[PDB]
Ligand binder design. Structure first.
Ligand SMILES: Nc1ncnc2c1ncn2[C@@H]1O[C@H](COP(=O)(O)OP(=O)(O)NP(=O)(O)O)[C@@H](O)[C@H]1O
Ligand SMILES: Nc1ncnc2c1ncn2[C@@H]1O[C@H](COP(=O)(O)OP(=O)(O)NP(=O)(O)O)[C@@H](O)[C@H]1O
Ligand SMILES: Nc1ncnc2c1ncn2[C@@H]1O[C@H](COP(=O)(O)OP(=O)(O)NP(=O)(O)O)[C@@H](O)[C@H]1O
Ligand SMILES: Nc1ncnc2c1ncn2[C@@H]1O[C@H](COP(=O)(O)OP(=O)(O)NP(=O)(O)O)[C@@H](O)[C@H]1O
Ligand SMILES: Nc1ncnc2c1ncn2[C@@H]1O[C@H](COP(=O)(O)OP(=O)(O)NP(=O)(O)O)[C@@H](O)[C@H]1O
Lengths: 313, 313, 313, 313, 313, 313
C-alpha cells in the first residue's frame, strides 16, 4: 500500500516543503499550535505533515487524539461535535498541553458551517486545535484565516521528489531507469500520491521500470507520439493523424480531457513560432470547451486534427 | 437472452482481453485479490470477467457472496452498507479466505462517496474486496487508484467478436449471412452487449439474418444511403440531398446527434482525399457543436448539406 | 497590538460613521439609551462605538459595568444571567442612571434565545441596556427590532479610513507612500482590523511602506505583475506571458477564479482605450464562464493569453 | 385576511376604475350582461368587480351561481363543463333571467380551448354568461373579443390606494406611519393584492408599521441602499459597490432579475441628467438580457458596476 | 353580434376577393366542387365564402348538410367520421348531387391525419367534398394540394372594406367620420373580424365615431403620439420619452409586442433617411427578440428609448 | 392527361431507376416473380414499373389480370378477396404461368391486415403474386419483407428526368428553354407527376416555355425577384427592399419560414464571395431561429433586410 507505508513519520521526513516545515518545526520546540491552515494542490503533503506534525508532538500517543475527517460531507460537522467534547475534556496523556483535529476539503463549505469552528477556538485554545486543509486559501472566508497561521504547499520540486522516489525503490528492490524516473514525474504533476501510486503499479509488474512502462501504466502518450501526431497533422496527412490518435487512444485509453491535456503540453513545448502556437492553443481552448459542454469526443478531436491540417499552406 | 446465456463462465472464456486475464489468472492460483479497478469502453467485459473472476475462485458458491450494484444511484452507497456487514462477517463457505463486491459506473460519483470505500478496505482486506468498473481511469480520484490493482479493457477486435458471435449462433440455430455479421458490427461499435442483444433481436424474428434485418432492428441508416447523400450533396444537388436526409431521418427517426454521428463515420470512410475530408470534418465539428448548444436541428443539418454543395467547384 | 491600542476612546474618535455617531451623540447629552441594534459588515466599528458609547457615558468607570460577550456560543445566554442580576442591582457609581451589555453575533441565534432578552428589557430599562451587533438587521426577529433603536454601519468609505490610517502613522513614525496607502485599502476591503493589522505588519519591517511592501505582507499578486503579464501578452510574446502567469500562479497559488478576478481588475484599471477594453472583458467574461462550467483551468487561461496575442495587429 | 375581508361588496365599492364601473353600472339597471372581457394589470380589480358585478345582480344569492376558476389549468376546461350544464338548466332563483362564470388568466390558452366557449355563448345567452380576465386584450384571439363587451382596467393611482389602505387600517386598529404607507406602495407596484397582503403581514406582527417593517416583510432593498450603491459605483469605488450589492443580495436574497429591477427603478428616479441616465439604462438593458439568456449573475452584475465606474471621468 | 349578423349570405356578398369569388362562381353554374383549399390571413373570408359557397348551392337547406369543424383539435378527426357516413349516405335533398364539410386550421396537423382525408375523396367525390382552410398553402403536404382546387385569400383591399364598413353603419345608424373609417383600417390590418368587431365596440358607446374613439377601443396609440415619442426620443429627451410611452401604455394598455409593433410602423413611415431608419429597425429587431425570449418589458422598452437618445449626436 | 399518356409501357421505358429495373429485367427472361416490395418517395415510379412489369410479361393481355388497389382503405382487403379467387383460378391466357396484384400505400396498415396476405402467398405462388408499394421499407412488418424481393426507388436524379422531360416535349412540339427545364425541376422535387403535370400546364398556353412561365404555373416566387430584393437590399435601399418583400409576400402569400427558405436558396446561389455569403447565412440562421421561437415575422424579416443594408460599406 505504498502511499501509506511511506507516510512520513516526522516533519523532517516530509519533503519539498522546506518553506512550510522549516517554520512548522519552530512550533514543536515551543509546543505552540495555533489553528493551522494548509493550502495547496492535492497530493503534496497537507495530510502528511498534518500527521507528522501531530506525530512529532505526541511521540507514540498521537493516534489516540488526532482524527482526520472530511469537511465536505455536510451533515456531520454537527455529528462529529461529540468527538469535540470528549477530546477537549481529555488532557494530553504524558506532559503536553494541547490537542489536534484535521479537516480535509475545508474549502467546500458555504459561509455558515465555517463559523461553528469559532466557538471551540476561543473555548479550546487552552486544549483543542484545528488544521484546515484547502485547495486554495482564497476560498476560506476571512473570519477563519483570521484565526489561522497559514501554510501554502507547493507542488513538490523535481529533485526532492526524484530523491524520495529512489529511496522508495532501493528499499523495495525495484529497478527504475533514469528514463522511468523523469517520466514518473512528467506524470506526477508534482503530486506524490500520483507518483508513488504509479511507481507501485509499475513495480507490481516485471522488473525493469522503463520510461514506457510508466507512460503505459498511467495511460499517457509517449511525448514522442503526441508531437508526432501533432506534426503529421500539421503536415497535411489528416487520415494518418486520425489513425494515430485512435491507436493512441486505445494503447493507453485516455479520456477526451486527457488527450486534450497532453495535446496542450506538447503544443506548448513544440519549438514552433509564438505566432502559430497561438492559433493552435486558441482552437484547443475551443475544443476543450466543446467537450466539457458534452459534445462528441471522437468528432471534436478529429475535428481538431482537421483544424491543424488546414494550416498546411 | 443470449447476452447472458453466453456470459463467460471462466476467466479462460472471456476473450480479446489476454492483456488483463493473463495476469488476472495469476490471482486465482495464489487466491489473492486486491481491490480491482476495471476500466474501459462499455461492453468489453468488465462485468463479465468480474463475474468469471468471482466464478473461478468460488466454484459453485459465487452467487451467494458476489453482488453487483450500480454505483451511480447516489442514495444507496449507504443503503447497501448493511450488505457490507453480513457479507464481511460470513466466512467464504468451503475453504477460501476472501469475498467480492462489484460496482458498475464508479466514475459517476463526486469525491465524497468515493472515500466511504476506504473504511472497509483496511477493515476488510482480510475478508472483503471491491471491483470498480469505470469508463476511464482518469475519472476516479487518486485515493482509490491508490488501493487498486488496475486493468484497462480494450475494445475487442473485429474477428474475435465475429467468431464469438457465430458460436452464439451455430449453438442457437440462427442463420446469419456474411452481410449480417459485418453489419452486426458496424452496429456493435465494438461493444458486445449491443452486438449480442441486437443479434438476439434478429434471431427472435423469422429465420435468415440479413445485412438489413440488422440495420432495421437497431434503427440505423444503411451506410449506402449516407454515402449516397453525402455524394449527391457534393455533386451540387442540394435540394436532392435535403430530400434524402429528410426521408432518411424519418425512415429510422434518428436524433441530430445520431445523424451527425453516421455523417462522420461515412465521411471518414469515404475514399476521398485527405485534403477535402478535412474541410468536411472541420465543418461537421462545427455543426455538431451548434446542435449541442441547442440550435436548430433541421437548419444546421441542411445548412451543412449546403456547405458540401458549395465545394462543387 | 494596534487594532486595540487604537480602539477609539470616544464617539468623536469613531470615523466614517457620522450617520450613526452624529445621532448616537444625541444620546449622551440626554443620557438616554434604548437598546441599541448595531448592524453592518464586520470590522466597521460596532464593537468600537459600542465601547466609546459606553466610554462617553461613564467617564473612567466603564470597564467595571460594560461586558461584551459573544451571543452565538449557545449554552451561555443562560449562564451569563447571574451577571445580569449583580449588574442590574448595582447603581452606576457616580451620578448616572443606567448600564450596558454588548452582544456580538446576535444574528446567529434561532427565535427562542432572542426572547429571553425581553424579561430584562421592561424589567431593566430603569437600570440595564443591551447593544446588539449583527451582520444584517433582517436576521433579527421582529419582536426585538421592536424594542431597539437601530443603527446601520456602512463599510468605512475610502478617505475616512485613509485619513485615520495616516493619523495611526504620523503618530507612529512610519512612512507610507501614496501607493502604500491606496494599496493598504485594496487590501482592507473597507475593514479596519484587516487594514490596521496589515499596516502594523509593514511598519514592523524596515522603513518606507511601499505599494509592494503591502501586497507582500498580506500575500497577493503584485498589481505590477498582472499588468505586466497582460501587457507582454498584448505585445505578442505568448510563451513569455504563459510563463509569467504560471510562475505567478504558484508564487501565490491562486484559483482560476482568483486569477480571472485580478485579470479583470487590472484589465479595467489599464489606461487603454474604452474600445479595446471591451474586447478584453467580453472575452474574460467568456473564460470565466468556461471555468465555472468546469472546463480546464490551465487551458482556458493560457487560451485567453492566446486571445490577447492575436490583437497584436 | 384583509385582501378578502375588504373585497368590494358592490360596484360602487370598487375604486379608481370609474372608467369601467360607470358603464358597468348601466348593465345592472337593465339587467343585461354580454360576455365580459376584463383586461388589465394584475391586482386592479377584475376579480373584484367581477364579484361585485355578480353581487349587485343577485343580492344575497350570488355564491350559489357564480364560480371563479383559473383558465390556465389546461385539462379542466372540459372537466368543468358539467358545471356548465347544471348551472345552465337552473333558473336564477328569485326574479332574474341570467347567470355568470368567471375565468381568470384566460390569456394563457392557445387558440383551441378558446373556441369551446362559443357553443355555450349562443346556446346560453338566454341563461349563461362568461367574464374573461386577461393581462392584455391583444392576447385573446379575435373570435372571442367578437362576442365580448370589453373593459380595460387601469392601475389604480397612488392616493386612491393610499386612502383605501388607511380605511383597511383604521378599521383594523393598525398603526401605519406615513413612511409605511408610501413604502407599502413602492412595494405594491399599483397592485392591491400585493399591497393589502403585505400590510396584513405587517399587521400580524407587533404594532407600529414602519417604512422598514414593510421593506422587510416583502424582502426588498431599502431604496436608500440602491441609490447609495449606484452612487458609490459612479464615483469610482468599484470594490466598495461590489461589496454593497453582495451584502445587499444576501440581506434580502434577491434574484438577478430582482436586483436588475430595482437597479432600474432607482436609476430612473435618480436626479441625474437625461443624458447619462440613458447610458446607464441602455447598458442595464444589456445586462438584463445577458442574465435571461442564462449568463452568469455574479459576473454580469459586478460587470455592470464595473460599467458605472468607468464613467467616473 | 355583428361579425355574424353580417356573414355574407351569397358569394356576390363576400368582398375584396374577386380573385377567388369570380372563379368560385363558375362552380355554382356547373354545380361542380372539387375539394377546396382556402388559404390566406385570418379574418379575410375563408369561413365566410365557404358558407356563402355552401349557401349558393343549397338555397335554403345548407345548415342541414354543411358542418364546420376545427381540424387542430387532434383526437376528433376520427371522432367526426360517423358524421362522414350519415352525411355521405344522405342525398342532397331537392335536386343537387353533392355535399360539403369545412375544416378550419388544417395547417396545424402533422402528415398522418392529413392522409385520412383521402379515403373519402375517391370514395366520396360522387357525394362528399371538403373545404380546407389554412393560413398558408405551403404548410399542407402535397398529397392534398394534389386533390384540391386552391384559393389564396388576400387581406381585404382598402375601398372594398371601407365600403362594406359603411353599409354596416348606415344600416345601424352609427356615425363614423372619415377619420374613424381610415383609422378603423389602420387597425383592421385588412382583417374584417378585427374591423367589424372594433366598429361594433365604438358603436356600443355614445354616438359620433371619431379617429380616436377607434384608436382607444383597440388600444393602439394615435399615430401622432408614437411619432412624437420616437421624435422626442431622438431629440435626446430620454426622461420625457419614457414618460410618454408610460402614459401611452396606460391610456390604451398595450402589450410589449403591441408597442413594439406600432413602434415599427411609425419608424417605417417616418420620413427620415434610409440610412438611420436601418439603425432604428435593426435595434427594434433586437428589442422585439429580447421580449419574446421573456426578458423585461419595461426595461427593454425604455432601454430602446435609451438607444434612440444616444444617436442625438 | 400527360401523367398517364406517358406511363411507361415497358421496363426499358421507366427511367432513373436502373438500380431496380436492371435487376427487375432478370425476372422477365426467367418469368419468375416473387412478391415484389417497391419502396421509395412518391412519384418515382413504383406504380409505373409495377405496370410496365406486368406489361412486359403479358404482352397485350395485362389489363385483364393485373389490378391496382389502395391498401389503406381499411375495410376492403377482405372485400377484394373474391377478386383473389376468380383471378387465382384463371390460368394466364396464352403461355405464362403466373399473375399479379398491386397494392399502393401498404405502409399504412397495422400488423393484422398484413398477415392476410400470407395465406395466398404459399397458396398462390404457383399462380398469384403481390406487388407492395410503400413509402419506407422499415414500416412493413418483418413477416412480409420475409417473403418479398425488395426494391428501393430513389428520387429520380436530375439528368434522367431532364432527358425524359425533353422526349415528352420534342414529341409534343413544345419549346422549353434551358431555364424552363432547370426551373421545371426546382419545382419537381424529383417527382414526375408534379413535373410532367406542370410542363403540361405551361404547354397548354402560348408557346415558348420560360423559367418564369414555369414558376408562375405552379405559383412560386420568381427566383429573379428574390435575388432582386436581396440585391437592392445589399445596395442600401432598405425602404425599397422592404417594399418588395411586402408585395412579394402577398403576391404569393408565403409564410415566414417560406420566405426565409427562398431567401436561403437565393443567398446560396448568389454569385457573391464565399466570404460575405457566410455573413448572410449566419444571420439568416439567426432570423430563422427568432421566428421559430415565435418572435415577429414582419419585424425580424425587415430586420434582416436591415442587416443587409448595413454591409453597404
Ligand atoms: N510532501 C510529501 N513528502 C513526502 N511524502 C509525501 C508528500 N506528499 C505525499 N506523500 C506520500 O503520499 C501520500 C499522499 O499524502 P498527502 O498529500 O498528505 O495526502 P493528500 O491529503 O491526499 N494530499 P495533500 O492534501 O497535499 O496532503 C502520503 O500518505 C505520503 O506518504
Ligand atoms: N470481452 C468479452 N468477452 C467475452 N464475452 C463478452 C465480452 N464482452 C461482452 N461479452 C458478453 O456480452 C455480455 C456483455 O459483456 P460485459 O462487457 O462483460 O458486460 P456489460 O454489462 O455488457 N458491460 P461492461 O461494463 O463492459 O462489463 C456479457 O454478459 C458477455 O457474456
Ligand atoms: N381596484 C380595486 N378597488 C377596490 N378594491 C380592490 C381593487 N383591487 C384590489 N382590491 C382589493 O384587493 C383584492 C385584490 O383585488 P382584485 O384585482 O379585484 O382581485 P385579484 O385576485 O387580487 N387580481 P385581478 O386579476 O386584477 O382581479 C380584492 O379582493 C379587493 O378587495
Ligand atoms: N371577405 C369578407 N367579406 C365580407 N365580410 C367578411 C369577410 N371576411 C369576414 N367578414 C365578416 O367577418 C366575419 C369573419 O369571417 P371569416 O374571415 O370567414 O371568419 P374567419 O374564419 O375567423 N377568418 P377567415 O379564416 O379568413 O374566414 C364573418 O362572419 C363575416 O361576416
Ligand atoms: N421512373 C419513372 N419513369 C418514367 N415515368 C415515370 C417515372 N415515375 C413516374 N413517371 C410518370 O409519372 C407518373 C407518376 O408515376 P407513378 O409512380 O406511376 O405514379 P405514382 O404512383 O403517383 N408514384 P408512386 O406511387 O411512387 O409509384 C406516371 O404515371 C409516369 O408516367
Amino acid at each position: 500500500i505504498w502511499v501509506e507505508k511511506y507516510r512520513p513519520r516526522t516533519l523532517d521526513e516530509v519533503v519539498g516543503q522546506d518553506e512550510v516545515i522549516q517554520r512548522l518545526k519552530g512550533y514543536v520546540e515551543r509546543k505552540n499550535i495555533p489553528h493551522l491552515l494548509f493550502s495547496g494542490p492535492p497530493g503534496t503533503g497537507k495530510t502528511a505533515t498534518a500527521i507528522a506534525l501531530a506525530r512529532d508532538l505526541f511521540g507514540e500517543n498521537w493516534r489516540d487524539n488526532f482524527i482526520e475527517m472530511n469537511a465536505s460531507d455536510e451533515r456531520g460537522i454537527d455529528v462529529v461535535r461529540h468527538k469535540i467534547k470528549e477530546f477537549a475534556r481529555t488532557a494530553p496523556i504524558g506532559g503536553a498541553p494541547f490537542k489536534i483535529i484535521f479537516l480535509d476539503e475545508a474549502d467546500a463549505l458555504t459561509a455558515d458551517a465555517q463559523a461553528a469552528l469559532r466557538r471551540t477556538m476561543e473555548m479550546y485554545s487552552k486544549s483543542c486545535r484545528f488544521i484546515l486543509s484547502c485547495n486554495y486559501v482564497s476560498r476560506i472566508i476571512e473570519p477563519i484565516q483570521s484565526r489561522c497561521a497559514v501554510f501554502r504547499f507547493k507542488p513538490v520540486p523535481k529533485e526532492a521528489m526524484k530523491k524520495r522516489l529512489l529511496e522508495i525503490c532501493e528499499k523495495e528492490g525495484v529497478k527504475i531507469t533514469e528514463d522511468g524516473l523523469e517520466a514518473l514525474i512528467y506524470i506526477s504533476g508534482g503530486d506524490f500520491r500520483k507518483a508513488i501510486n504509479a511507481l507501485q503499479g509499475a513495480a507490481a509488474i516485471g522488473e525493469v521500470v522503463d520510461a514506457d512502462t510508466i507512460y503505459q501504466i498511467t495511460a499517457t502518450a509517449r511525448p514522442e507520439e503526441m508531437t508526432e501526431l501533432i506534426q503529421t497533422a500539421l503536415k497535411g496527412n489528416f487520415m494518418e493523424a486520425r489513425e494515430l490518435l485512435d491507436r493512441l487512444m486505445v494503447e493507453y485509453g485516455m479520456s477526451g480531457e486527457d488527450i486534450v491535456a497532453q495535446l496542450f503540453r506538447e503544443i506548448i513545448s513544440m519549438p514552433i513560432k509564438d505566432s502559430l502556437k497561438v492559433q493552435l492553443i486558441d482552437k484547443l481552448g475551443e475544443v476543450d470547451f466543446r467537450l466539457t459542454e458534452g459534445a462528441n469526443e471522437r468528432i471534436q478531436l478529429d475535428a481538431y486534427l482537421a483544424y491543424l491540417s488546414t494550416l498546411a499552406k
